[PDB]
Design a protein around this ligand. Sequence first.
Ligand SMILES: CCCCCCCCCCCCCCCCCC(=O)OC[C@H](COP(=O)(O)OCCN)OC(=O)CCCCCCCCCCCCCCCCC
Ligand SMILES: CCCCCCCCCCCC(=O)OC[C@H](COP(=O)(O)OCC[N+](C)(C)C)OC(=O)CCCCCCCCCCC
Ligand SMILES: CCCCCCCCCCCC(=O)OC[C@H](COP(=O)(O)OCC[N+](C)(C)C)OC(=O)CCCCCCCCCCC
Ligand SMILES: CCCCCCCCCCCC(=O)OC[C@H](COP(=O)(O)OCC[N+](C)(C)C)OC(=O)CCCCCCCCCCC
Lengths: 54, 105, 90, 77, 69, 10, 491, 642
Amino acid sequence: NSYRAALEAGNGNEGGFDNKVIKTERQGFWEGVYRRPLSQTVEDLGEGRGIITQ
Amino acid sequence: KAVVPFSEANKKYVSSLYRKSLRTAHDWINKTEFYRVKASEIRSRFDANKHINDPNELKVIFKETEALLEDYAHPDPIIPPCRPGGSKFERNIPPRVEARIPIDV
Amino acid sequence: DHVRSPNVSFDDIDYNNSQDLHNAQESLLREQWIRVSALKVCRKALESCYKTSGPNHYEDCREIAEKYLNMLPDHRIQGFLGYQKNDPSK
Amino acid sequence: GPHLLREDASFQRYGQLRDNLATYWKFNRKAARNVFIFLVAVPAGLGYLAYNYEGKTPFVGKRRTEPIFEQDYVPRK
Amino acid sequence: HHIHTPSYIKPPTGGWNFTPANWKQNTVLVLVGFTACCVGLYKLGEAGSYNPKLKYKEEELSRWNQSAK
Amino acid sequence: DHHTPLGPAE
Amino acid sequence: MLVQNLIIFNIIGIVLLVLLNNNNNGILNKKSLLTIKNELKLKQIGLIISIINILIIIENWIGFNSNYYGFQNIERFLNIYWGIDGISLLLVLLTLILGPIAILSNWKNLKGYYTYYVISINMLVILMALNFICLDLVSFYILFESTLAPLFLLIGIYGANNKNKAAYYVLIYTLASSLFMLLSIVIYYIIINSTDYIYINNIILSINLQSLLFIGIIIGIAVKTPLMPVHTWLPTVHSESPLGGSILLAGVILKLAIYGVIRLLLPNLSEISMMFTPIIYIISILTLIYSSLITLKQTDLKVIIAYSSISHLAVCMIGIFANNLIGINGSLILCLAHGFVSPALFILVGGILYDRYHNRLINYYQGLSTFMPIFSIYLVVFSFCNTGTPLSGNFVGEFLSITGAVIRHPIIGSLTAASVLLSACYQMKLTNRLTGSVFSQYLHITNDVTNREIFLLNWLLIPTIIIGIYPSFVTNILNLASSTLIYSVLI
Amino acid sequence: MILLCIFTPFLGSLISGFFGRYIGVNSSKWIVCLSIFVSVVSTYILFIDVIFNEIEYTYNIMNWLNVEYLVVDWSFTIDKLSVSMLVPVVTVSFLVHLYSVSYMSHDPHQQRFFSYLSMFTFAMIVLVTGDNYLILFVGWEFIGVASYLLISFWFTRFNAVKSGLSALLINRFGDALLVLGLSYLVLVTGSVNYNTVFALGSYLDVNMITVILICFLVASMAKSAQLGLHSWLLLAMEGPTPVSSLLHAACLVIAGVFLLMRSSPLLEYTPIVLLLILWLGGLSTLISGLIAMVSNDIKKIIALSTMSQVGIMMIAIGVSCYNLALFHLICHSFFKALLFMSAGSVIHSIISEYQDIRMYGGFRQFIPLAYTCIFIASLSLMAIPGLTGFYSKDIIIESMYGEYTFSGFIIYWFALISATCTSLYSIRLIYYTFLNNPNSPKYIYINLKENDIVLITPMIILTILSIFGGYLLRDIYLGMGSPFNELFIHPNNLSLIETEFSLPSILKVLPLITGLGGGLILLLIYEFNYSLFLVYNNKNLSKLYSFFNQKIMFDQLLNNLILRSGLNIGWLLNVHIDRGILQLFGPLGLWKLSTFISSKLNKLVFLNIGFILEIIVLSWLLIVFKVSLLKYILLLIIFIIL
Ligand SMILES: CCCCCCCCCCCCCCCCCC(=O)OC[C@H](COP(=O)(O)OCCN)OC(=O)CCCCCCCCCCCCCCCCC
Ligand SMILES: CCCCCCCCCCCC(=O)OC[C@H](COP(=O)(O)OCC[N+](C)(C)C)OC(=O)CCCCCCCCCCC
Ligand SMILES: CCCCCCCCCCCC(=O)OC[C@H](COP(=O)(O)OCC[N+](C)(C)C)OC(=O)CCCCCCCCCCC
Ligand SMILES: CCCCCCCCCCCC(=O)OC[C@H](COP(=O)(O)OCC[N+](C)(C)C)OC(=O)CCCCCCCCCCC
């Protein structure tokens, strides 16, 4: 689970980031993205204080 | 402690119980004619037991006299305004007289 | 002078181009500040009516009061991090 | 300067003690009674209320959809 | 009587029945200031105030309620 | 009487 | 220009002061002219540099554009990219303004080595001023931790009776925690290969990895803006440090932790900041209520003001984590207003009384409004400002921060309103005791506030009431800068 | 005119405060009294132009807050209600300053006293003329700042210092709630303006109005000193007599009523809040009437009279008759200012300057002028027909019954007892000090005179208002259908018709019949049959007397229990947390641990071949054991530390 192992397995940020490529599944632990599916935000933050509704 | 009748210190205690008794009557009774009547009685109650030559007999009265005052204590005693507890106590105290010792800050 | 807003959307640009991404963030901020300015104007119209109507303020100021309570939740500054980093379509 | 303060020996002990209460403190059953209340009981109680209502209060511009006054009167007499 | 220590204690409000020797002169300098400012405050009050019941005619409001509809 | 005289010039 | 002029001139000034003082050391005893009047010439050159530092930033404030979104005045110096935006500009202005005031506060109340003190004060101010204008986490951390070296020596050399305990507290509390902030900075450099602000603002991390980095960074922040239960260093250090060290340690150092939220948590860790905001409110509301109650049982004069500092900073953190513009603008105005009122009280408590009677115990002081009236006017005036009286700049900060707290969370965020009542409990009790009853029988009549100490008070009160009456001076700079910190998707 | 009417007191307070040294004592007082008089005349001009001519004034200095949608101005307006409150405030305060020119003549600090007093008037003026709630909140706090400075004016007196603190801290309790109410006003409507918030009253959720207004009610309980937050009201008598007159007739003690009246458009859409005010405003009137009858200090009696009268306005608010509560507010400021002034005149005249009415007696002829002012004012207080307090207080008592609900019936008797006790503790006050057998020594009676003409003028002018003010102004406020939209009455809450037409014919006389008819009976006992009241013998009466003389033992409950527990929690936090668990998980605790660990490690460094050789050979075991056994070796190592 070290970043070195993830990088050596293609699960690191060696590949850059992009807004036109959205991944439906959740990204790996060490992976970063420019943009995220909103359903992942709601499934984490929950609706309420400024997410989706007011 | 022990109570020694006719000693100077024992008399002053009885003097103090007298100022507690009459002032407390004065606190409740707000007419002079009614106050003198009750104030006369208290002295009679104070002077009837004037003669005691025994320690232990006297100490019971001291125990009783404190109880009499505590139950009859006024919830708002009259106080002179400039005496401690009064309406004008500590008002406009003149400032202290002393020399200003300058400091080179 | 009066700078024109760079009307640009997060949905048409590449975030690798951090110059264009900056405009997409600056354009989404400026439009929101207009809505607050639009909101403060509408509220001014409500205030004149209530002061002028007096007893009739419930009638002569009916749709302004209705509209003001409708624009209030969404006519506020929300930033761009919400929409830059989230994808409503997904 | 000139020591413009009449230093007091008893105040110095009081000041010395009040700034050194850590030395004499013990973790007896009394302290745990207080420590549990302030570091756990209150934070958890408020922590539940904070998370329970976190997102359940859309009070911005809330509207009324239910009458306040009553229409018909039903006298006892 | 008692001593005010007035050699050094000089608060802005005097202290213990303070009255300067040239108090008659200073008051006229102060009575001007109250008069100078009260007159000055009257000018601004007239120039900068308004009636908030006559700025907009009801004929203008009646278009606002319908436009928002 | 009050007899408090005026203080210095200010 | 800016940073390059700000470092090169200060380094030149520091070298100049060292050359002048140490020339005569040699092998022979020296009675030179520069030692006369307690190093007065060397103190003056230190005071001028503090004033000149303000002139450098104003040269760049004129060019600032309030309608441009993004960092301005960007420059690269020492392979580090700098820059200014709306939020950073005002905090830089506060930091440099406290420069002359920190030096002026200690003009003639040190036993010696004034040149060392003057160099350290200008050094700490520059390090903190530069901390608002860097553009990467690594450089943020470098400036965030470099202030320990002078501050630890300054408190130890010039401190009060317990200076050794105070020195051992600031060095270890603010290093054993900021090292946890280094770990989260390092992890940013491992996965993203860069710690620049702009580059890392656009990246989203996994919600597990967001929680780790937040916990690391907020550990380093919860100590600098002391949040219970890790606040124990601040009351001790304040009661023992030199008076000038207290003005900087309260005026600026605490506000570096609120600025830590603005750069390190809200933009890049936006998703996990929403999750922690309920928890942050719990910690800050308990900090607000406990710090106010603990102050009611304190005896040292300079500790009592120290805890009042903790209650206000808890409110500042409450507002900044509110996800609206009202809370964020209110939190930043409160930090600026607290940046003047807090130093003013330490001057009143540890700088005017302590320089005359040399005792900080509250029991000796009462009835001070009799033979020290000018002192009691400012103590009364600053007591109200410290408690959010509507005409001061603190009320604007506190009202908005409370308003923003309720907007974010109506139920528990409403408990911020207890700040209005509790702040008046410990503070007004302290003022009412000091300026009440007869003059104390343990003190002796002495001078009232001197002309220098009036100058310090008037120029900490004047900025406070301008921001109160017309806070739009601060707001016109903040609005476009503070609007980039809000995370919300409405559909 | 508006800008002259508002800020004229302010520069008057500054001039006495900052130039009072350079113009001495005599001029400082008069220039201050001039500033209030300028605002009085300016106010009366606007009163004519606003109340009768239907005109409004609004001076907007500049912007205060401009945080996105939340925009607040330094805007000052004068509507009907703002000018309905500037008559009681500025008029009374001008006479108070005129009265206080002579009352304070024997006090060394008269530049500071007047500087505070005109500051107090300016804050209240800002309180009622602000066009939003924040401008109101600014004056709402400087009311407490000026009151704290006024109440503790004799800062050398220990009692006046702590009573000033008691007023500020309890008021800041409501101020905290008032701030919280404003935040929910921004949360719900994004505004604190009057033109905006009141225009949206019906459309808003009922729960939200309650959250806002409950906070307003709690804040108003602090300032108006109702039951629960009232312990400070009687502690306020430590200030000079002019302070009590201005602060208990035409200032903060009424500011609680104004906040509820101003927010009437919201208050009509949450009947639960109105119902609470009715009970708080009914219980408070009952209690302070009962407390006053067994109160001996003269200023305490009048101060308790203010709490009962101020609570009468609360039940008027509760039944949504804001026009009634407002009108009684004006009428109450007239005689209640006079009563404190007349109390100040009595105490000034008696050379011992006593305040216990148990040390007075037979004053009616030595000071006939002081007595008559109390007599005319008290009758106006007791609502004698044809006076001013009659035309304002009496209708409220009717409208408790005219509501024809359960709460109106229950409060009706609490209010009617308040009218009864008002007619009783007044008679007790007048007899004990003017008609009783003398209690002071003779040397006092031979040296009892009235006071100078400067002290006399303000009282007579307030007397005339207490005979004619209420009748003239009755139709302006209580008029059937007079346009006063500033006070908003929902159509289902109007009972002025049934209050005046449907009441039983015996109730319309019930307050007065028990008022004077019951007054004579008590007068005879105090005169002819005082032996009944020697209550110390009777334990039932002594317990009853002690309870009400100690003010429902509410003061003891606050201090002995609530305040001390609040300070104790500070102590427990300061003992078990700050110097307790945080030092154990901090400096002290880690020093203990490090002293233990380092004392073991020092014992290991010693030059010995046998020791170093044995350690090395043990470490060869780490090559033999399987790596999964490391943590057990980690635990075994930790054990041998112990
Ligand atoms: C506010 C937020 C929190 C901030 C602080 C967070 C960290 C705080 C950690 C607190 C834990 C220590 C505090 C409690 C220990 C206090 C020690 C003590 O009280 O004495 C117990 C005993 C010392 O012996 P004695 O002389 O008899 O003293 C008795 C006095 N009651 O001591 C002993 O007998 C020893 C106890 C067992 C020792 C086991 C050793 C295990 C290894 C040590 C832990 C290492 C921790 C660091 C690990 C990495 C280090 C590189
Ligand atoms: C809306 C904003 C309004 C601001 C207008 C300010 C007018 C009042 C100025 C008072 C100056 C003065 O004189 O205070 C100082 C007075 C002077 O005492 P003295 O009577 O001169 O006697 C002198 C002899 N002593 C001093 C022995 C009695 O003593 C004090 O130290 C009193 C304690 C501090 C009072 C603080 C009041 C500050 C006002 C509130 C600020 C918000
Ligand atoms: C902006 C960053 C620039 C870098 C500055 C580097 C500091 C080196 C200065 C050496 C000059 C010197 O040794 O001189 C000594 C000078 C002045 O002593 P004095 O009182 O005049 O002499 C005293 C003896 N007498 C009076 C008898 C003659 O005091 C100083 O050193 C103060 C500044 C350094 C203190 C903290 C150092 C921490 C370093 C780590 C920081 C991250
Ligand atoms: C996650 C929260 C992080 C917060 C910061 C870290 C804790 C702060 C500790 C303060 C230290 C202090 O106080 O240092 C000074 C202290 C002692 O105190 P003293 O000044 O000598 O007086 C008190 C002395 N008596 C008893 C004689 C009066 O020295 C020590 O005990 C030395 C050992 C401390 C080791 C610190 C390890 C830090 C590890 C942190 C991760 C668990």
